[PDB]
Amino acid sequence: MYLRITNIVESSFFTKFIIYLIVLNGITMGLETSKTFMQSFGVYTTLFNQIVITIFTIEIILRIYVHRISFFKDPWSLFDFFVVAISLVPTSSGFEILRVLRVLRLFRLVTAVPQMRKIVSALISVIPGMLSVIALMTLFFYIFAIMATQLFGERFPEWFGTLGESFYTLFQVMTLDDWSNGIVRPLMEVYPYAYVFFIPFIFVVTFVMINLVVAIIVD
Amino acid sequence: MYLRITNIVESSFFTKFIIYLIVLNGITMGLETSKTFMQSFGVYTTLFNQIVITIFTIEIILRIYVHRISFFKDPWSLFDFFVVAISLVPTSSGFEILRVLRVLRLFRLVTAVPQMRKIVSALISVIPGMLSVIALMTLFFYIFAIMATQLFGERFPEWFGTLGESFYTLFQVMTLDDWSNGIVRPLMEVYPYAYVFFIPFIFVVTFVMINLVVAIIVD
Amino acid sequence: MYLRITNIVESSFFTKFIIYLIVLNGITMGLETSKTFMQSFGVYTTLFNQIVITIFTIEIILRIYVHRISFFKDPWSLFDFFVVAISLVPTSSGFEILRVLRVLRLFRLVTAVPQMRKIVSALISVIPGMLSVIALMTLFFYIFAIMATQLFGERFPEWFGTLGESFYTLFQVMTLDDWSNGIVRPLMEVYPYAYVFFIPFIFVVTFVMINLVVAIIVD
Amino acid sequence: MYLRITNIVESSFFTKFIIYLIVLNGITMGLETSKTFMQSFGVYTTLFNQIVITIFTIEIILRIYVHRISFFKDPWSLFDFFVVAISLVPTSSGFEILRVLRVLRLFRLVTAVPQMRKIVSALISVIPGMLSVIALMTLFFYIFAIMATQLFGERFPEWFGTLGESFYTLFQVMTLDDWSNGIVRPLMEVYPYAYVFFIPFIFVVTFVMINLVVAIIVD
Ligand SMILES: COCCOC(=O)C1=C(C)NC(C)=C(C(=O)OC(C)C)[C@H]1c1cccc([N+](=O)[O-])c1
Ligand SMILES: [Ca+2]
Ligand SMILES: [Ca+2]
Prior knowledge:
The structure is a homotetramer of 219-residue chains. The first copy, chain A, contains 13 helices and no strands. Chain A is mainly α. The radius of gyration of chain A is 25 Å and the shape is elongated. Chain A has helices at 2-9, 12-31, 35-41, 43-67, 75-85, 96-101, 108-112, 114-124, 127-152, 157-160, 163-174, 180-190, 195-218. The two termini of chain A are 48 Å apart. Chain A folds into two domains: 1-114, Four Helix Bundle (Hemerythrin (Met), subunit A); 115-219, Helix Hairpins (Orthogonal Bundle), CATH 1.10.287. Chains C and D meet through helix 9, helix 12 and helix 13 of C and helix 2, helix 5, helix 7, helix 9 and helix 11 of D. Bound molecules: nimodipine and calcium ion (CA) (2 copies). The site of one calcium ion (CA) has 2 residues of chain B, from loops. It is classed as transport protein. Keywords: Voltage-gated Calcium Channel, transport protein.
């Protein structure tokens, strides 16, 4: 029984089938975007969705019987679990958002194709080295976001009225997004010396990123 | 017949004649852009076109006889075939997009010069190693265009009205084009939490891009 | 039992005491941004800031006693003195900019945690190898800013009327921020050839920046 | 007189002296940017400019005698020659673009200082390596520019009415500057399929750009 189940879930037919179902669901979720299609052929999909969600639900249960505690030492499987989880909460209730969170289950195609799994892992493996530059930068943002609120948040509350608001504008500036005509020239019309805050800020923020890239390559 | 024609195609005069013609057709094509020129000389160059494409048609036929089945195993020759045949489609009124695709024949400069082919081939060469990331990106992109159409498409039809639209808008944001004042600040006036979609989205698309380039460097 | 004090300053508890203070003071200045907070607890929060500022002043005196002249060849300590000093001038009749400057002491978190210290040390270390190119470029901007003031400052004073203005603007075009529809297309309405100035400038400035990054990594 | 003169121009006193004239003129030329200064100090420095041009002219004449055939095979001196020639153009002639071009002479500071020379020399050495790509890139822009004018020029003449405009605009899209909301989206109000030109256009130009840099690094 234990061996009989185990032999099913690991077969090359179970995985091709589920993957096939993933590929199919993802095609329907695209289709669900057309309100035309919804009108003429969407009660079909509402049930198709619940059919696919169960087969996947079974898959998760089976894999937990087979792998037992080692299922939950698999970051990919926890992900699989958690992704199917949020897809279990009802259409109604909570908030409209959980309904939209359901689309995250297409990320199972990543979980289930070894080629996707390898790219993702390789990418993740870049992260641990960065946790030093990241923390410093987050602090850097925090201090400046504070200076930006007090300086500019009274006359420019949309941009700087709040720490959070100061954080959003500074990120925007960081991505260098319409930073001059859109933010600093207006600021400079009240506060002519605002360029002393943002030009240095940009240097730092551009230096750190470049140097972040050097160290990635070398490491 | 065989050896006489075969002797003309491989000649240094042949390829030189063709190449020189490409440069001429290219100077000439810049001229068909000014309708000042077109009212005073257009008949001269509309047929200069016509005789160039005749020569190219002939040359293509000859190279096929000389190279037989090995012609269509040659990517550059394959290219010339398609790049010439297109320019053979009638200017006649039924479908006038094809008229503009004719300028692509200037890409034969690439085909016929060995220093450029090196570059192109070199460029394409980095692609097969990237295909996995292309897929991953597109799967990421696809999930998010879905999320965007259902989240923002109601109140902001232009930007998220349609899966295709959200794809478009999302492409812009990765490129970092007028993304904040131009898209999410408006989004945030109706939906204050849009930054929880687009700010992670920005970290991700950027993370992958950088790592892709590093992947390019190392590979 | 001569120095007596020296044994306390060098201890694990002293340092951990300052870091715990900064992070509290760092958390405090955040909450000082909430306008609601400054009503409910504004008086409470002023007492905490003043204690810490005293403690820190004490902490600086002790470190001077111990290190003597070796304190003032430590950039990190030099930074600590002037940053603590800043937060101490009277709010009275001065410049009210100094009230905002006192957030700079949150950069002491960097100064007192060697990991951050090493990051800041690593970053600075890319600067001396770069100083040459910084000098060429600064020389490049300075020369073109002059050119831009003379060429476009009559009819476009907001952007180029003054040398600093030509600098700020020129810097913006360099960051490529909103430069065609935002700067050059306007200019070009009065002065049709302005692309011969700005387009080359962009090539140059981007080429250098790109080769600068390249030259650092390879070497 | 020649051999006697040659002993003069190679001395360390000489180089630093002409360098000192550059830096002084470089300072004064900054000053010529101010309306105020020019009002109450203009003739002192209008005079001082003519002196320097003469000295540089004499300096150029001397070095010719010293170097003979070699002078006109020195890249740094050819620059030196012509940028002095510009300043030798008379204060008039109806093309005051040249009056502005005077400040091109401050670049002699680059030719006269070997570390500057070294950076410039280092930078240029990158270029012959890229001549294949620039030709390729310029060929690519040339082709798509043609397509633009015939595709979008009649309804959008400012942006695409003509080759240069298409060139300009295309150059603009390649710096990714306001490309979407500013150019492609408007186009789409009238030409719904414009994303098929510009999005491929962007991918390719980045690809070539990115890959170019990677080639430089490894080599
Ligand atoms: C004619 O009188 C004004 C001259 O002032 C300047 O040349 C500046 C120098 C000296 N230092 C910098 C760093 C500046 C500068 O412009 O730097 C930018 C690159 C950040 C400018 C400046 C000085 C005051 C105000 C502005 N402004 O509002 O554009 C610009
Ligand atoms: Ca912009
Ligand atoms: Ca932009």
